[PDB]
Swiss-Prot record, chains A, B:
Known partners and oligomeric status: Homotetramer. Interacts with TRPM1; the interaction results in the formation of a heteromultimeric cation channel complex that are functionally different from the homomeric channels.
Gene responsible for this protein: Trpm3
Part of the whole protein covered: 1234 to 1266 of 1732
Parts forming coiled coils: none
Protein name: Transient receptor potential cation channel subfamily M member 3
Family designation: Belongs to the transient receptor (TC 1.A.4) family. LTrpC subfamily. TRPM3 sub-subfamily.
Compartment list: Cell membrane
Inactivation phenotype: Trpm3-deficient mice exhibit clear deficits in their avoidance to noxious heat. Trpm3-deficient mice display reduced hypersensitivity to thermal, but not to mechanical, stimuli in carrageen-induced inflammatory pain. In the chronic constriction injury (CCI) model of neuropathic pain, intraperitoneal injection of isosakuranetin or primidone do not reduced heat sensitivity in Trpm3-deficient mice.
Function as written in the Swiss-Prot or TrEMBL entry: Constitutively active, non-selective divalent cation-conducting channel that is permeable to Ca(2+), Mn(2+), and Mg(2+), with a high permeability for Ca(2+). However, can be enhanced by increasing temperature and by ligands, including the endogenous neurosteroid pregnenolone sulfate and sphingosine-1 and suppressed by intracellular Mg(2+). Implicated in a variety of cellular processes, including insulin/peptide secretion, vascular constriction and dilation, noxious heat sensing, inflammatory and spontaneous pain sensitivity.
Amino acid sequence: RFNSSNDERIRVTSERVENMSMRLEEVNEREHS
Amino acid sequence: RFNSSNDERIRVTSERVENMSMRLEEVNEREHS
């Protein structure tokens, strides 16, 4: 019941979006060609 | 308490998703091959 609540899903989505944005900026900054 | 509210998390997630989508379209459209 705790893991399927809206607040927990929103928080986990926000954390994963932040990490994914950081990694994508890392990838884009590190192009070779 | 303000930074952990649902509205602020939704807004920040939306902004980061928009920026990430723009950067991902930039990466995908421009390829060396």
